Amino acid sequence: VETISFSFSEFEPGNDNLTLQGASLITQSGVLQLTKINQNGMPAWDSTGRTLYAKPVHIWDMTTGTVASFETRFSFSIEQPYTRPLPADGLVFFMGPTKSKPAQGGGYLGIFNNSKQDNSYQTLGVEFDTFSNQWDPPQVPHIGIDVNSIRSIKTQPFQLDNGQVANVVIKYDASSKILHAVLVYPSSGAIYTIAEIVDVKQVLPEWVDVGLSGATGAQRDAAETHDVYSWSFQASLPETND
Ligand SMILES: CC(=O)N[C@@H]1[C@@H](O)[C@@H](O)[C@@H](CO)O[C@@H]1O
Numbered sequence: 341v342e343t344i345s346f347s348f349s350e351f352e353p354g355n356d357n358l359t360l361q362g363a364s365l366i367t368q369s370g371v372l373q374l375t376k377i378n379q380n381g382m383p384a385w386d387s388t389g390r391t392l393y394a395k396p397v398h399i400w401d402m403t404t405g406t407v408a409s410f411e412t413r414f415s416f417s418i419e420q421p422y423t424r425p426l427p428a429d430g431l432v433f434f435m436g437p438t439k440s441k442p443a444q445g446g447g448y449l450g451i452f453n454n455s456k457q458d459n460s461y462q463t464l465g466v467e468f469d470t471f472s473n474q475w476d477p478p479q480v481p482h483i484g485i486d487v488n489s490i491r492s493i494k495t496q497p498f499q500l501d502n503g504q505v506a507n508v509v510i511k512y513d514a515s516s517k518i519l520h521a522v523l524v525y526p527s528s529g530a531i532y533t534i535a536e537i538v539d540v541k542q543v544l545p546e547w548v549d550v551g552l553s554g555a556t557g558a559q560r561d562a563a564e565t566h567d568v569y570s571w572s573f574q575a576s577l578p579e580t581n582d
Pocket residue numbers: 426428429445446447448471473556557558559562
């Protein structure tokens with residue numbers, strides 16, 4: 341079994357295991373700020389930032405035909421300091437081609453370029469969407485499972501506990517092809533669950549980059565924070581299949 345795992349209970353500036361792109365920054369207090377916060381202490385609009393694990397992950401093998409099972413857990417907080425103008429845009433856990441650079445920001449969350457369904461994206465994502473775009477359901481925020489498109493194959497509305505820490509668990513079972521995700525707000529005790537069938541061998545390339553991406557809106561003050569406090573990941577790929 342080919343395995344890879346990492347766990348950050350806190351983030352350290354200078355850690356070479358993480359690749360920061362765009363506006364993402366690790367504070368001295370150990371917090372990963374995906375999108376920029378201005379010197380005045382308020383979130384900046386038109387900001388896009390991503391953080392990738394510095395090593396690619398072997399998710400499936402064409403020779404043996406095996407597929408990896410994986411699990412990721414992370415804690416984040418989104419604080420929307422204003423109710424108007426409408427806050428945007430959200431954050432997303434994603435897996436895609438290696439050596440990837442930020443895509444379009446705003447409603448595309450830094451991982452897509454348009455709202456089309458396109459096999460070539462070869463991207464899988466679990467989002468936490470705060471702004472309702474034309475391709476979105478009316479309810480926000482919502483959790484969504486994105487397969488080669490910003491238009492989710494399935495969504496689950498959730499209530500934001502403003503500025504509070506949320507715990508997320510995303511697990512993929514290769515045998516059943518079920519991607520199941522859970523979001524919990526310890527502060528209120530709220531629990532949300534969502535699941536869908538995803539055949540990763542049909543969606544992702546054999547080796548992928550794993551990361552987190554966040555973005556604020558394209559209109560002035562259409563923003564919020566996208567802070568991550570901890571992140572762990574583990575993938576197990578059976579080397580053979582007899
Ligand atoms: C397509 C696109 O990125 N749209 C963005 C949307 O996501 C949101 O950020 C909004 C802020 O009011 O600005 C634009 O409409």
